[PDB]
């Protein structure tokens, strides 16, 4: 049964609630983004209206075969009426097509559902600037002060400089980047751009990327692995056994692999700067774990919430344990006492 934190009171609406069968009283199902824990349950047999971004709707039609007549894509930054209720979709700074949803309830309550997001000061000048928010349904993935990581720009600078140096020293080195979902495309695209190569990948992953409205994509990716020196593999294959096997398949074109695993946070973050990151090496294979996050750090989250000043916070992540829930509630109270709302 659908948990309360997926339900929007005073409406017929749910958010990211496709794995519970027919939810009683739901007239419209919203989908914030195309990640499996959020879309779980959708397929070509779904017959209720799904509301989402254009990019999410391209993925639903092409990857899950949801029929067109049930997909209702909305433009961003635009007031729309859904089943009698004003809504707006805002960029979430998460993966491609990911949105936050503003609901303007018929009684005057305003609700922000962040979906998954990486808070940014640029959000302080969106349509959120223009009215009060009563209730915040918050992505609390990294809601504890241990969770620090660098900017996405510092991480991509590290990656590009590392790859360019390795391949210039050895023109017979292959670069490999792990993936298992959409998101984090800048990692492999930025490295291929500095090397003058396309990114090579499987037909299934090329199909996914073709749904994303990324400019000039036909110029940047390919299914012809032999023409590319940046390859994309499943995240599960980014280990010494998996990479040794891949190197066999390339027929002596290459004699070294440099591989990247774009994790979120790992506790090497509590001690080490990005500048100081080193790989795990075995023979002619090196693997870098890089802290490229598409979720808020603790400090980014705290700044957003202290700016927004919501009357009530509903966490959407880490809700399954009493210790996690009590930790998050203590931080919310600190934030509110420090800022004065
Ligand atoms: Ni996500």
UniProtKB/Swiss-Prot annotation:
Section of the entire sequence shown: 700 to 1040 of 1040
Tissue: Expressed in brain, heart, kidney, liver, pancreas, placenta and skeletal muscle.
Function, in words: May be required for DNA interstrand cross-link repair. Also required for checkpoint mediated cell cycle arrest in early prophase in response to mitotic spindle poisons. Possesses beta-lactamase activity, catalyzing the hydrolysis of penicillin G and nitrocefin. Exhibits no activity towards other beta-lactam antibiotic classes including cephalosporins (cefotaxime) and carbapenems (imipenem).
Family stated for the protein in its record: Belongs to the DNA repair metallo-beta-lactamase (DRMBL) family.
Subcellular location(s) per record: Nucleus
UniProt-reported outcome of changing residue 139 to N: Impaired nuclear focus formation, reduced interaction with PIAS and increased sensitivity to cisplatin
Protein's name according to its UniProt entry: DNA cross-link repair 1A protein
Quaternary structure and interacting proteins, as annotated: Binds constitutively to TP53BP1. Binds CDC27, which is itself a component of the anaphase promoting complex (APC). Binds PIAS1.
Domain of life: Eukaryota
Induction of synthesis: During mitosis. The mRNA encoding this protein contains an internal ribosome entry site (IRES) in its 5'-UTR. This 5'-UTR generally suppresses translation while specifically promoting expression during mitosis, when cap-dependent translation may be impaired.
Gene name of the record: DCLRE1A
